[PDB]
């Protein structure tokens, strides 16, 4: 899996993942 | 899975994932 | 897996991973 | 796996990993 | 695995690893 | 594995490793 | 493995290693 | 393995090693 | 000035201040 | 000035201050 | 000035101060 | 000035101060 | 001034002070 | 001034002081 | 002034003082 | 002034003092 992101002063949340099982936030 | 995002001063939330099981936010 | 990110004064959270099992945040 | 990140005064959290098993945060 | 990061006064946490087994934080 | 990092007055934690087995923090 | 790091008054923790077996912190 | 580090009044911990077996901290 | 806020898992940005001079985000 | 905030797993940025002069983010 | 905050696993940045002069982030 | 904070595994930065003069981060 | 804080495995920076004059980070 | 803090494996920096004059970090 | 702190394997820096004059770190 | 601290394998620096005059680190 490749991860390429370009951010600049982001007050917001940037989520990007791949879960095979249960996950909690 | 590839992840390519371009953001700039985003006050909003940017969600992008793939869950196979249960997930909570 | 490759990891390339470019950030600059980001008050927000930047998540980017790949979980095969259960994970909690 | 390659890890290349460019940050500058980031008050936010920058997560980037690859877990094969269970992980907790 | 190569590790190249450029940080400057980062109050946030910068995580970047590759776990084959279970890991806890 | 190569390790090249450039930090300057970082109040945050900078983690960068590669574990084949279990690890705890 | 090469180790090159440049720090200056870092109140934060800078971890950078490569473990083949179990490790605890 | 080469070891080159440049520190100046670092209150934080600077870890950089390569373990083939189990290690505890 | 009083500051009372109640948040719970907010992916969005919550700004609330009072500037008398110029300010940039 | 009083500061009372209640947060729980907030991926977003929570800003709350009072500047009399110029400020940059 | 009183400071009372309750946080729990916050990936986001929580700023809360009062500046009379110029300040940079 | 009183300082009471309750944190638990916070990857984000928690700033809370009161500056009368100029300050830089 | 009273200082009471409760932290547990915090990868983020926790700042809490009161400066009457100029301060740099 | 009273100082009571409870930490456990904190990779982040925990600052808590009261300066009447100029201070540099 | 009373000083009571409880730490356990802290890789981060724990500062807690009260300066009336100028101080440098 | 009373001094009571409990540490265990701390790689980080633990500062706790009270200066009335100028001090350098
Ligand atoms: N969460
Ligand atoms: N959530
Ligand atoms: N979490
Ligand atoms: N956590
Ligand atoms: N943790
Ligand atoms: N830990
Ligand atoms: N540890
Ligand atoms: N340890
Ligand atoms: N910004
Ligand atoms: N910024
Ligand atoms: N900044
Ligand atoms: N900074
Ligand atoms: N700094
Ligand atoms: N510093
Ligand atoms: N310093
Ligand atoms: N110093």
- Single out the residue of D12, N10, P5, A22 nearest to residue L8, CA to CA: N10
**Chains M and B lie in contact, requiring 3 or more CB pairs less than 8 Å apart:** no
**Cβ–Cβ < 8 Å for E4, M2:** no
Q: Judging by beta carbons within 10 Å of its beta carbon (0-12, 13-18, 19+), is residue B16 exposed, middle or buried?
A: exposed
Name the pairing type of β-strands M23-24 and N23-24: parallel
Name the pairing type of β-strands I14-15 and H14-19: unpaired
CA distance N2 to O17: 10
- Cβ atoms < 10 Å from Cβ of H3: 12
Q: Go through P1-25 and write b for each residue having 16 or more CB atoms within 10 A of its CB, e for each that does not.
A: eeeeeeeeebbbbbebebeeeebee
**Cβ–Cβ < 8 Å for J14, I14:** yes
Q: How far is CA P12 from CA G12, M22, N20, N25, in A?
A: 9, 27, 26, 16
Q: By 3-state DSSP, what share of chain A in percent is helix, strand and coil, each rounded to 5? A: 0, 50, 50
Nearest chain M CA: its distance from L15 CA (Å): 5
**Whether residue L25 has its Cβ less than 6 Å from ligand 11:** yes
Q: Which residue has the tokens 């990140």?
A: D5
Cα torsion J7, E13, C7, B25: sign: negative
- Cβ atoms < 10 Å from Cβ of I22: 11
The three state secondary structure string of I1-25 is: CEEEEECCCCCCCEECCEECCCEEC
Reported structure resolution in angstroms: 4.2
Which neighbouring-strand residues pair with H16? Answer: G16
SS3 K20: coil
CA distance L16 to J18: 12
Alpha carbon of G11 to ligand 12 centroid (Å): 13
Residues in Cβ contact with B3 at an 8 Å cutoff, skipping those fewer than 6 apart: A1, A2, A3, A4, A5, A16, B16, C16
Name the pairing type of β-strands M2-6 and J2-6: unpaired
- Single out the residue of F13, K23, L11, M25 nearest to residue E7, CA to CA: F13
User: Cα dihedral angle (G7, G8, G10, G13), rounded to 10 degrees?
Assistant: 10
**Cβ–Cβ < 8 Å for E11, L11:** no
**Cβ–Cβ < 8 Å for G14, F10:** yes
- Single out the residue of N15, G6, G12, C12 nearest to residue F13, CA to CA: G12
Q: Is L9 left (phi over 0), alpha (psi -120 to 50) or beta?
A: left
Contacts of D24 in chain C (CB under 8 A): 23-24
Please provide the DSSP assignment of F1-25 as one string: -EEEEE-SS--S-EEEEEESS-EE-
CA distance O10 to I24: 36
Nearest chain D CA: its distance from C11 CA (Å): 4
Q: How far is CA A21 from CA C18, L6, N22, in A?
A: 11, 31, 52
Terminal-to-terminal C-alpha distance of chain I:
22
Please name the method used to determine this structure: cryo-EM
- Single out the residue of O2, K5, J25, E10 nearest to residue N3, CA to CA: O2
Please provide the DSSP assignment of O1-25 as one string: -EEEEE-SS--S-EEEEEESS-EE-
* CA-nearest residue, atom 1 of ligand 10: J25
Q: Which residue has the tokens 């006064």?
A: E9
CA distance F7 to G9: 9
Which neighbouring-strand residues pair with K24? Answer: J24, L24
DSSP assigned state of E5: E
CA distance J6 to J24: 25
Instruction: Please report the residues numbered 1 through 25 in chain D whose beta carbons come closer than 8 angstroms to any beta carbon of chain L.
Output: 9, 11-13, 15, 25
């Amino acid at each position: 899996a490749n991860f390429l992101v370009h951010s600049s002063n982001n007050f917001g949340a940037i989520l990007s993942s791949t879960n095979v099982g249960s996950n909690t936030y």
